[PDB]
Structure formats: C-alpha cells, structure tokens
C-alpha cells in the first residue's frame, strides 16, 4: 500500500503500547516529525512470534530468504504486535500459507505468486506428487492454547524513500501563536513576508486567502484557523539626517529622521 500527499501522524504510533517491536533501522525514531519524505510504503503480513527477528536485514531463515527479504540499507520502521484471539478461533486457523522451498534466494522487495512443484533432485517427477518433489507452499496450524512464541503476530513494515519529486508527506504542520502589532516574519503558505499584522475593517469573501492592492503588493492575508483579516505593512525604514550649527560655532549635532515615527520632539517631518 502506497501512502502519499497527506500529513504524517506518527504520534498515535508511538503513544500506543500494544505493539511489541518498535525498532527503526536507518533513521532514528526520535525525529520522524521534523523529516519530510516523498513516498511512504506500508506492507502487512502475519508471522509466528519465533520468526519476528528474521524480518530485520542481515538475518537469514526460511521467511527471510524464501518469502520476504529486506535490503541491507533499510531506512524504515517495523511494527509488530500480538493478536491471538482475533486471528484464531477455538478450532485454529488453516487458511494461511507460506513457502519452504525455492529454486534460489529471493532479491529484496520481491514477491512470488506462482505455486508450481519445487524440484529438489535431478530426476523430474513429471509434474505430479511424489518422491524428490513436493509442494513448496505449506498451510499452517494455529492453536488457542499454544505457546507464547507460537501465537500469531501481525507485522507491518514502513518504508520511506526519497526521489526527485517534491515531498508529498511531511510531519504534522506546526502552528505557533499569533503575535500582532510587532515587526515579525510570517509564512502563510505563499510568501515569506516580514511586517506587522494589524486588525483591518474590511471583510473578505469566503473563498479567498490572499489579497493585493493598487500597487500590486500582497498586503492583506487571511489567517486560516480563526478567520480574521490581517494587513501587511513594512516595519520601518529611513535615513539618518543631521543638522550642524557650523564651524567655529558649536560642537553638538542632532539626529533627524525622515519619516520614522517615535530632547525629543515629534515634528511633522519625522522624528
């Protein structure tokens, strides 16, 4: 199953404790949230509690080499948990199939569906049941009162890959507290603008998120989480002008601002 174009939510994944295995190869489990991925894949299969370590790369076994093989550069996570009452009734479950024989080893991320007759010896058996050839697919027997290592376990493997496509899956969107009437920087999904956010008196139609002016400048953006209209204004800029009494007359000067609004006198021509 391929999962993409959605906000990743691993919070409920580690805030649950019903699972038995939370080993994340390649990438550390402590920082999934601040990582953006392109494609997310999730496999699912049921295996006995004995053959759970064989899912890890490097190990070898019947399941690890004939049914499911993982690459040595795996950068994902493996989730396993125990479900005995759901997967087995009082009589046991016999609809689950697995492989014990194959012509050779299996490459990673490769599955096989063919159910031919496995050949072990040199003399062919002409495609019928007999000696030196058997049926490589085998049914499995479950018990309700069996051992803890022989109860059914559900294993789900998560795979994360990076391609040239833009990231379609990122960690939960972070929404900081809104601060107004201060020279701050905001990024409302379309622009990295720096300025104040005053309270406007103009209503916006209920389909718009942006807004421009006569001079074609984005100066009005709607906040999405509370539906208020906030204006964008540059903080302040100007020049430092000085007045001088002259030479051989004085030594002190005064700082004059062109249009910056604030001994100190508030003149019409600035500060």
């Amino acid at each position, epitope marked *: 199953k391929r999962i993409s174009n959605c906000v990743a939510d691993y919070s409920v994944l*580690y805030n649950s404790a019903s699972f038995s*295995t939370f080993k994340c190869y390649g990438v550390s489990p*402590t920082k999934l949230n601040d990582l953006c991925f392109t494609n997310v894949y999730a496999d699912s299969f049921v295996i006995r509690g004995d053959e759970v370590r064989q899912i890890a790369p490097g190990q070898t076994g019947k399941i690890a080499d004939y049914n499911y093989k993982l690459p040595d550069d795996f950068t994902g996570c493996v989730i396993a948990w125990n479900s005995n009452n759901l997967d087995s009734k009082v009589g046991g479950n016999y609809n689950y199939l697995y492989r014990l024989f194959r012509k050779s080893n299996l490459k990673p991320f490769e599955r096989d569906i063919s159910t031919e007759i496995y050949q072990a010896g040199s003399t062919p058996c002409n495609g019928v049941e007999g000696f030196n050839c058997y049926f490589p697919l085998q049914s499995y027997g479950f018990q309700p009162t069996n051992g803890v290592g022989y109860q059914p376990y559900r294993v789900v493997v998560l795979s994360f890959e990076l391609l040239h496509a833009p990231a379609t899956v990122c960690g939960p969107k972070k929404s900081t507290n809104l601060v107004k009437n201060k020279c701050v920087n905001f990024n409302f999904n379309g622009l990295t603008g720096t300025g104040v956010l005053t309270e406007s008196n103009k209503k916006f139609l209920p389909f718009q998120q942006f807004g421009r002016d006569i001079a074609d400048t984005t100066d009005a953006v709607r906040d999405p989480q509370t539906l208020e209209i906030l204006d964008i204004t540059p903080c302040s800029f100007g020049g430092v002008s000085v007045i001088t009494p002259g030479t051989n007359t004085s030594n002190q000067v005064a700082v004059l601002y062109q249009d910056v609004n604030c001994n100190v006198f508030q003149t019409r021509a600035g500060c």
Partner: antibody
Amino acid sequence: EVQLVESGGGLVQPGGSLRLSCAASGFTFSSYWMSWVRQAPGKGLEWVANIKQDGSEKYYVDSVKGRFTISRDNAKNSLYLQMNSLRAEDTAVYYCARGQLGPWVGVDYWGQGTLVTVSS
Amino acid sequence: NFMLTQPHSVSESPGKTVTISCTGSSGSIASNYVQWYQQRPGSAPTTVIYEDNQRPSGVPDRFSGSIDSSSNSASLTISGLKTEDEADYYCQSYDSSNWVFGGGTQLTVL
C-alpha cells in the same frame, strides 16, 4: 530545564495507606509519557509503573498487581500515586519518571526522590 | 521472564578502553531498544545511553556502545576513564508492556 519535586514520604506504617506526589514544570504534561520507578537502598534498579499521557492506559509489575493505583491531570501538572497494603519490602526511594515518545526510547528522566521507609 | 545479565564490578583499570557486557535470556535484545543508565551514588540518576547509538547533549564522546547478535549481548565501551567516572551502570529493555532493569555494575576505583 525540567524541574521536579517529590514529597510524599517521611513516615512509617505497616500495611497502611500512603500518598506520594511528583510535581513537574517547564514542559507540556499532556503530550509525553510518564512513569514511576523505585530502587532499594544498597540494591539495584527496578521498574514500578507507567501511565499514558492522558491516563487512559496504566500498567504495573506482577509483584504489585491487584493493589496500587495511579492517576494524572493536566490542569495543575502533577502526578498522583496512591498505595495500599504495604509490606516490609517497600523500603525504597521513589522517582517519578518522564518519557519522551514511548517505552522504547528510555527513562532518561530521574527525579531526586523521597526516602520512603516502613516499620512495624 | 525477561531478565538482563551483567556483572557487578568491572572496569577497574586506569586510563584505557574497557567494555561492559549486558546480555538477555528470554528473548532477543536486538528486537527492541536497550539503554544504559548512569546514577550518582547517593544522588539522582542520569542516562548515558539512549536510542542504543546516540548521546544526550553535554555528555562527552568518550563513552561508546555497540550491539552484537551472535551472543545476544549489549556492549558499552568507555575510552577516557577520567576522574568523573564513579558510578554503577544498568541495562534496561522492554519485552511486552513491562520494563526490566539490570542488576547493577559498581565502578568506583578508576
């Protein structure tokens, strides 16, 4: 800087009822795992309890099963631990443990603790 | 019946690399994460190992750890062996909805 105080001990009782409290500050109490852990004087470490960040799921060791209870709230940022039917083995120093993501990351958070001894 | 086996007095050496081994019995310790905890004698405990490969901020890089699967054991290696190392170590794992702690390995004479 995460700040922890524990003050629930200081008295002896055989088989009675006792209350220990751990108060935490400097973080969000409603998002991370919490646990309770004790050690005997002169002995090694052992695990006591854990609780989910909303208090929905709680678990114990089989030695204290049947007794013991734990509860939490997010309004005043404190952990509640209540005990009953104490024994002589309960002479231990209790630390309130704080988790990060789950029971696999590790404890990583150890309070100063309160000396708790029992007598008959 | 998951339990972790480790010594009680090791690393009694000055100024060279030594290793401490903690091994599991009931199950494979490589399935889940194992951690090492360093506690001050008579004071609050701390942690030297989390995630089985990384370090807390401020902890020196002298310590190092490794995992082998042939023995089902956890190896923690100490390089500097400075005057700060006076503590006892524990190894903690997780089998199923429960936590298990190690016996403890006292290290005093460095």
